[PDB]
Design a protein around this ligand. Structure first.
Ligand SMILES: [Cl-]
Ligand SMILES: [Cl-]
Ligand SMILES: [Cl-]
Ligand SMILES: [Cl-]
Ligand code: NA
Ligand code: NA
Ligand code: NA
Length: 129
């Protein structure tokens, strides 16, 4: 599913991501924009052999099981395919664990490089929330 911007903002809010770990909703929408362009089916293979999955490009080395990332963990206790669903619940639940791991949203390199420090409220501007 390719979410609209405000559609995704609303879904993220409903699932408790707004202000989670102190990160306002616009931070999460911005991260999803630059990780996946709001496409739940996004995947990307990394040089290390891990793969990133879903709207927030959650990586198989630590967070989900894909059966093809040797030596990896599955800290969200989920198949990586669950992160590709039109239903964002699994991605939200796993993102909550990731952002709680110590480095906040810097876990998402694209958030650090493209969202952090910017006017992230623009990502929710105009949305009925
Ligand atoms: Cl957009
Ligand atoms: Cl915001
Ligand atoms: Cl594996
Ligand atoms: Cl933080
Ligand atoms: Na990408
Ligand atoms: Na892929
Ligand atoms: Na790629």
């Amino acid at each position: 599913k390719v979410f609209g911007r405000c559609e995704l903002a609303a879904a993220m809010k409903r699932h408790g991501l707004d202000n989670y770990r102190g990160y306002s909703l616009g931070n999460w929408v911005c991260a999803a924009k630059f990780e996946s362009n709001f496409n739940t089916q996004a995947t990307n293979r990394n040089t290390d052999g891990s793969t990133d999955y879903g709207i927030l490009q959650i990586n198989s080395r630590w967070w989900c099981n894909d059966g093809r990332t040797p030596g990896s963990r599955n800290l969200c206790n989920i198949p990586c395919s669950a992160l590709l669903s039109s239903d964002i619940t699994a991605s939200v639940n796993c993102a909550k664990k990731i952002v709680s791991d110590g480095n906040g949203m810097n876990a998402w390199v694209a958030w650090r490089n493209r969202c952090k420090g910017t006017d992230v409220q623009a990502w929710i501007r105009g949305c009925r929330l």
